Amino acid sequence: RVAAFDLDGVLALPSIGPTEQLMKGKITFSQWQIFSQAMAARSINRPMLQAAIALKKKGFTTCIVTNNWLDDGDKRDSLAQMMCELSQHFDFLIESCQVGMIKPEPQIYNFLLDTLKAKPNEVVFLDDFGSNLKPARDMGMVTILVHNTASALRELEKVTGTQFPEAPLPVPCNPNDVSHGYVTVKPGIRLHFVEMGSGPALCLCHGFPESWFSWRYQIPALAQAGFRVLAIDMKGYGDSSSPPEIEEYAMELLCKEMVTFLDKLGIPQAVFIGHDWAGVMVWNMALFYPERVRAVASLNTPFMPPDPDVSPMKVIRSIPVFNYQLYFQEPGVAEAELEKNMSRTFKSFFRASDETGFIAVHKATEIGGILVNTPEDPNLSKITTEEEIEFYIQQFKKTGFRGPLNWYRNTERNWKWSCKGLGRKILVPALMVTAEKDIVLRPEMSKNMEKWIPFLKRGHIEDCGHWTQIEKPTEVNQILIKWLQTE
Amino acid sequence: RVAAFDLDGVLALPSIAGAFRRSEEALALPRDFLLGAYQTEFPEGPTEQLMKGKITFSQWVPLMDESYRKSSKACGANLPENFSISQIFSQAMAARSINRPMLQAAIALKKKGFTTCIVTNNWLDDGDKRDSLAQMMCELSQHFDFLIESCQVGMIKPEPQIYNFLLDTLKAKPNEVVFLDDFGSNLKPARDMGMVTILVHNTASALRELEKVTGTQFPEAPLPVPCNPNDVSHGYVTVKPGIRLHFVEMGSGPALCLCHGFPESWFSWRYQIPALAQAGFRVLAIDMKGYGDSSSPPEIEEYAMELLCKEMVTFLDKLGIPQAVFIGHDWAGVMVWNMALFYPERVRAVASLNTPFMPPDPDVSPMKVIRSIPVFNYQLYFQEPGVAEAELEKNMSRTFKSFFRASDETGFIAVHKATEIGGILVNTPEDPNLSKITTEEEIEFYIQQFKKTGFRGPLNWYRNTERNWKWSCKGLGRKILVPALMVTAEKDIVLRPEMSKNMEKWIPFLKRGHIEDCGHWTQIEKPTEVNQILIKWLQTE
Ligand SMILES: CCCCCCCCCCNC(=O)NC1CCCCC1
Ligand SMILES: CCCCCCCCCCNC(=O)NC1CCCCC1
């Protein structure tokens, strides 16, 4: 079925002849004040926008039929953003000032069903007036008024269809419904990414074994937060070049290229928010290229400078919760296990802080592999949808697993490199977000990070596993936004 | 054969060193007091952990500050107790910009086939204003093959080991390589090794003079920074099922999309894109529907201006951009004005090249107005599908060198005769001469581009006359009340300037720009100006 929504005050609040032609479109705004400001005060009616994606996801045809008008005002920008935001969550836009006719003139209505290809019955309209809803039900449409700021609305709306949650999730941007940039930094290597919103720029780098798609919940919000996001596919993963050479992944290089990728893209500075392995790079970016980093934020991953008199490898042979990691060392091995069956491999890796079928991070060598435990047919974690997983699959089907793993296999070199930035410190805006129930990459591993990063601001989330962006998304967003906001 | 230059005093001016100087005298400081912390074969203390990249900048202040305070009252003149060097080294670094002529001198050899690069005594600026450096550094980025940052390779000038590290990568001998510095004390090693020394003193000329003497000659008014070849980002937005729009990106916001005309491609703005970016903008040289790497359907309806504008809008939403500056030329320009006319909200501002805002006559068949204007015959010729195509496709080489010619050049197109002699390239030479406005390669791109898209799609732009008319007739009671720019070309045969004159009846406040001796290919004929005009425009709004 389909869902129709007015705008005057059904998807934006506060709510709100000759200029009856202003509606029709023969006249613009700057055509005729003490009223302008009012259109700028109103914002999106989130729970309603929710109620929409709801159906949209549920297999309906959403849409907006409003009594528009052309805004050439001094503050139309607003409308744009709102418009450009609602854009993605509807199939058709029946703007009054676009099709000549305006509510409640019956010709507009006939125009909708017409484009909608539907019968008045299997279509429900939503208006805060009712004088505009008379036609709808008259036609055989399921009418629904507003009067208030929703609730009662979304309520008698639930009835027709399904139910909506009180505390929802941030809209998961996706899939192809996005732009796909492609920068070629070195001959054989090109880095694919994603883009959204207008500057300043902040690149979101993922970890192991993930993809840009991971930030699927941060990207939109972050954009709408007034930013130009660049969910990049880290070298080796997804649509970016994934060479077979190990040297190709030395952190020293990854950071260098990361920089190139900027020049190429003509961006002179960006905010670098990293997680997992990325997070490592992010901190090194901050450490080696201050100029190009506007600011840095890290999830789970803490800044752990290297010990100059302590073989980096030894520090791994030590920490017990880094076995699997060791297991990865040998090329072909680790790969062979994860590739053998990507389905499991993933539903396996991706599990909540409070969930079964965990990975074998420490018994790895001994039991023969990071997955030697765990069921065969893992259960879908209440953190990824089959589809959500399938993307990761398709992604990896084309890239393989060697490339990503080669991130681990550059220990000595990495050590030898990060040793140069031992006499200096991170003096650019920084953020360290710690996860609580994160088995490996435990919070307490930061504690002395300030010895290196004074002024370092922090953020911490409870009941959060390693998959922060996907486990506690809404919070991650908040924390992140509010962070950028205050700097 | 390569050529390198110590950025501060060669690529960047006024040499930061100058600031120290003018600061010494300021506080009656004996010649070279705080100067040592920069110009001294005494690379020691903190200033040596700085260029060495061991410690950042911010640290180098509290440390250097006190290391200065060393000889403060001890062995030397009075150096204010609380006296620091933070915000004084900071300004000097910011107040400095790129040495345009010298950069020129570089791209020269680069073009000429040399291995440019920069060997500077760097330091990692984690300053409150380190951005500046990023930009200037992000710019010089593309013009050099190698960047030898002192603060990145451990060694700093003039310690021999650095130099021996450069040739190592440049895989060259001391003889076939030239070094540019503003000190000379830094140049001493170079000569001794076997390199071509040159005191980058003075400011320019004199340097480029003694330079010229060993390379070639440099333009007096060089050709603006061109953004090509494949050294760019390539976005790809899918607006409707089968249709996806490819484009190009550069710099940081706000956004302004550059739409091309017929028969061109994003590559046309190759001269505006960079400059525009460097002008503080995020450019989107888009490949108009039908052209190059964007979907180029076979349907005619697919190109109704009404649609092109709609999709143009979608392309924005999709890209998450809520507003942009729309600068159009030719057919694009038309759309651009309609964009302004139909979607005010999404247009921050509009600029048009050659193409004027010509609303439609409500009581005058749009077609008739074409059958009338004599300089629109070829256009008419295009009407019939397959025909026009067949002519332009038969041999893209000519087709292009043909279309693309200067205001003052031969082999013109047959804009009015067409229909009669059947064709536009009909009476044009067999093998046209390369116009002093496009390089063979420049043309080849257009070829490859069109080889994959064909010619139907682009032409379908012409074939939507009635519909277009019927549509633009809706925006007859309103006007363009958003910032606008109308740039007129002088020697533009078709799309003559005088066709604007009453544009203000529709667009008050409409600002204008006009260029002389300019044909239809404005962006390629008078690029530098187009840039200026455009920039200065955006600048003042
Ligand atoms: C002394 C040098 C120390 C360098 C430390 C670099 C940081 C290592 C981060 C490793 N991260 C991961 O291995 N993540 C995987 C663990 C298994 C489940 C998915 C996520
Ligand atoms: C619906 C009314 C349309 C009115 C058309 C106004 C002017 C459109 C611009 C046309 N531009 C061109 O035809 N340019 C070509 C002309 C032949 C040589 C290359 C450039």
JSON list of N, CA and C in Angstrom, two decimals, chain A residues 4 29 70 84 133 135-136 144 175 183 185 204 218 257-258 268 308 334 362 364 413 421 439 449 458 464:
[
{"chain": "A", "resi": 4, "resn": "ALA", "atom": "N", "xyz": [0.73, 8.74, 2.35]},
{"chain": "A", "resi": 4, "resn": "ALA", "atom": "CA", "xyz": [0.90, 10.13, 1.93]},
{"chain": "A", "resi": 4, "resn": "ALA", "atom": "C", "xyz": [0.95, 11.09, 3.11]},
{"chain": "A", "resi": 29, "resn": "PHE", "atom": "N", "xyz": [8.51, 33.56, -3.77]},
{"chain": "A", "resi": 29, "resn": "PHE", "atom": "CA", "xyz": [8.42, 34.09, -2.42]},
{"chain": "A", "resi": 29, "resn": "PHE", "atom": "C", "xyz": [8.60, 35.59, -2.48]},
{"chain": "A", "resi": 70, "resn": "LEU", "atom": "N", "xyz": [7.63, 28.21, -4.05]},
{"chain": "A", "resi": 70, "resn": "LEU", "atom": "CA", "xyz": [9.01, 28.39, -4.44]},
{"chain": "A", "resi": 70, "resn": "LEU", "atom": "C", "xyz": [9.70, 29.42, -3.55]},
{"chain": "A", "resi": 84, "resn": "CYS", "atom": "N", "xyz": [16.12, 17.97, 1.19]},
{"chain": "A", "resi": 84, "resn": "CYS", "atom": "CA", "xyz": [17.16, 17.05, 0.78]},
{"chain": "A", "resi": 84, "resn": "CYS", "atom": "C", "xyz": [17.28, 15.91, 1.76]},
{"chain": "A", "resi": 133, "resn": "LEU", "atom": "N", "xyz": [-8.41, 17.01, 4.12]},
{"chain": "A", "resi": 133, "resn": "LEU", "atom": "CA", "xyz": [-8.60, 15.57, 4.17]},
{"chain": "A", "resi": 133, "resn": "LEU", "atom": "C", "xyz": [-10.01, 15.15, 3.75]},
{"chain": "A", "resi": 135, "resn": "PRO", "atom": "N", "xyz": [-11.61, 15.68, 0.89]},
{"chain": "A", "resi": 135, "resn": "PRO", "atom": "CA", "xyz": [-11.52, 15.03, -0.43]},
{"chain": "A", "resi": 135, "resn": "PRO", "atom": "C", "xyz": [-11.05, 13.57, -0.36]},
{"chain": "A", "resi": 136, "resn": "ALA", "atom": "N", "xyz": [-9.94, 13.34, 0.35]},
{"chain": "A", "resi": 136, "resn": "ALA", "atom": "CA", "xyz": [-9.34, 12.01, 0.49]},
{"chain": "A", "resi": 136, "resn": "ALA", "atom": "C", "xyz": [-10.30, 10.87, 0.80]},
{"chain": "A", "resi": 144, "resn": "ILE", "atom": "N", "xyz": [-6.50, 10.49, 7.80]},
{"chain": "A", "resi": 144, "resn": "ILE", "atom": "CA", "xyz": [-5.98, 10.57, 9.17]},
{"chain": "A", "resi": 144, "resn": "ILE", "atom": "C", "xyz": [-5.54, 12.01, 9.47]},
{"chain": "A", "resi": 175, "resn": "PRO", "atom": "N", "xyz": [21.62, 2.01, -0.08]},
{"chain": "A", "resi": 175, "resn": "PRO", "atom": "CA", "xyz": [22.81, 1.15, -0.20]},
{"chain": "A", "resi": 175, "resn": "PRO", "atom": "C", "xyz": [23.66, 1.68, -1.34]},
{"chain": "A", "resi": 183, "resn": "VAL", "atom": "N", "xyz": [39.15, 7.54, -6.05]},
{"chain": "A", "resi": 183, "resn": "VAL", "atom": "CA", "xyz": [40.42, 8.23, -6.22]},
{"chain": "A", "resi": 183, "resn": "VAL", "atom": "C", "xyz": [41.53, 7.24, -6.48]},
{"chain": "A", "resi": 185, "resn": "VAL", "atom": "N", "xyz": [45.27, 6.85, -6.14]},
{"chain": "A", "resi": 185, "resn": "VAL", "atom": "CA", "xyz": [46.42, 7.45, -5.45]},
{"chain": "A", "resi": 185, "resn": "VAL", "atom": "C", "xyz": [47.80, 7.07, -5.98]},
{"chain": "A", "resi": 204, "resn": "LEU", "atom": "N", "xyz": [35.63, 8.66, 7.43]},
{"chain": "A", "resi": 204, "resn": "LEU", "atom": "CA", "xyz": [35.35, 7.57, 8.35]},
{"chain": "A", "resi": 204, "resn": "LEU", "atom": "C", "xyz": [36.04, 6.29, 7.88]},
{"chain": "A", "resi": 218, "resn": "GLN", "atom": "N", "xyz": [26.16, 6.14, 10.97]},
{"chain": "A", "resi": 218, "resn": "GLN", "atom": "CA", "xyz": [26.78, 7.41, 11.32]},
{"chain": "A", "resi": 218, "resn": "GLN", "atom": "C", "xyz": [26.77, 8.37, 10.15]},
{"chain": "A", "resi": 257, "resn": "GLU", "atom": "N", "xyz": [49.43, 7.18, 1.89]},
{"chain": "A", "resi": 257, "resn": "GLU", "atom": "CA", "xyz": [48.38, 7.14, 0.88]},
{"chain": "A", "resi": 257, "resn": "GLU", "atom": "C", "xyz": [47.15, 7.88, 1.37]},
{"chain": "A", "resi": 258, "resn": "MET", "atom": "N", "xyz": [46.77, 7.63, 2.61]},
{"chain": "A", "resi": 258, "resn": "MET", "atom": "CA", "xyz": [45.62, 8.30, 3.15]},
{"chain": "A", "resi": 258, "resn": "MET", "atom": "C", "xyz": [45.78, 9.78, 2.84]},
{"chain": "A", "resi": 268, "resn": "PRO", "atom": "N", "xyz": [42.27, 20.00, 1.67]},
{"chain": "A", "resi": 268, "resn": "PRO", "atom": "CA", "xyz": [43.50, 20.30, 2.41]},
{"chain": "A", "resi": 268, "resn": "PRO", "atom": "C", "xyz": [43.51, 19.88, 3.88]},
{"chain": "A", "resi": 308, "resn": "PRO", "atom": "N", "xyz": [60.53, 1.15, 22.67]},
{"chain": "A", "resi": 308, "resn": "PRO", "atom": "CA", "xyz": [61.80, 1.14, 21.95]},
{"chain": "A", "resi": 308, "resn": "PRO", "atom": "C", "xyz": [62.76, 0.02, 22.30]},
{"chain": "A", "resi": 334, "resn": "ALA", "atom": "N", "xyz": [45.04, -18.21, 8.09]},
{"chain": "A", "resi": 334, "resn": "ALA", "atom": "CA", "xyz": [43.89, -17.45, 8.55]},
{"chain": "A", "resi": 334, "resn": "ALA", "atom": "C", "xyz": [42.90, -17.33, 7.41]},
{"chain": "A", "resi": 362, "resn": "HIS", "atom": "N", "xyz": [41.93, -16.00, 22.04]},
{"chain": "A", "resi": 362, "resn": "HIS", "atom": "CA", "xyz": [43.17, -16.48, 22.67]},
{"chain": "A", "resi": 362, "resn": "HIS", "atom": "C", "xyz": [43.54, -17.94, 22.42]},
{"chain": "A", "resi": 364, "resn": "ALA", "atom": "N", "xyz": [43.17, -19.57, 19.67]},
{"chain": "A", "resi": 364, "resn": "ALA", "atom": "CA", "xyz": [43.51, -19.71, 18.25]},
{"chain": "A", "resi": 364, "resn": "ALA", "atom": "C", "xyz": [44.56, -20.79, 17.96]},
{"chain": "A", "resi": 413, "resn": "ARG", "atom": "N", "xyz": [57.99, -3.52, 11.02]},
{"chain": "A", "resi": 413, "resn": "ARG", "atom": "CA", "xyz": [58.00, -2.26, 10.29]},
{"chain": "A", "resi": 413, "resn": "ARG", "atom": "C", "xyz": [57.20, -1.19, 11.03]},
{"chain": "A", "resi": 421, "resn": "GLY", "atom": "N", "xyz": [57.90, 8.89, 16.17]},
{"chain": "A", "resi": 421, "resn": "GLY", "atom": "CA", "xyz": [57.05, 9.87, 16.81]},
{"chain": "A", "resi": 421, "resn": "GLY", "atom": "C", "xyz": [56.97, 9.61, 18.30]},
{"chain": "A", "resi": 439, "resn": "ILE", "atom": "N", "xyz": [36.01, -7.12, 24.79]},
{"chain": "A", "resi": 439, "resn": "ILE", "atom": "CA", "xyz": [36.96, -8.14, 25.22]},
{"chain": "A", "resi": 439, "resn": "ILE", "atom": "C", "xyz": [38.38, -7.69, 24.93]},
{"chain": "A", "resi": 449, "resn": "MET", "atom": "N", "xyz": [47.01, 7.35, 28.20]},
{"chain": "A", "resi": 449, "resn": "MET", "atom": "CA", "xyz": [47.03, 7.95, 26.87]},
{"chain": "A", "resi": 449, "resn": "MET", "atom": "C", "xyz": [47.34, 9.44, 26.98]},
{"chain": "A", "resi": 458, "resn": "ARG", "atom": "N", "xyz": [37.45, 12.54, 26.18]},
{"chain": "A", "resi": 458, "resn": "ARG", "atom": "CA", "xyz": [37.06, 11.14, 26.11]},
{"chain": "A", "resi": 458, "resn": "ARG", "atom": "C", "xyz": [35.56, 10.90, 26.08]},
{"chain": "A", "resi": 464, "resn": "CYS", "atom": "N", "xyz": [28.71, -2.15, 25.57]},
{"chain": "A", "resi": 464, "resn": "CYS", "atom": "CA", "xyz": [29.13, -2.10, 24.17]},
{"chain": "A", "resi": 464, "resn": "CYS", "atom": "C", "xyz": [30.29, -3.04, 23.86]}
]
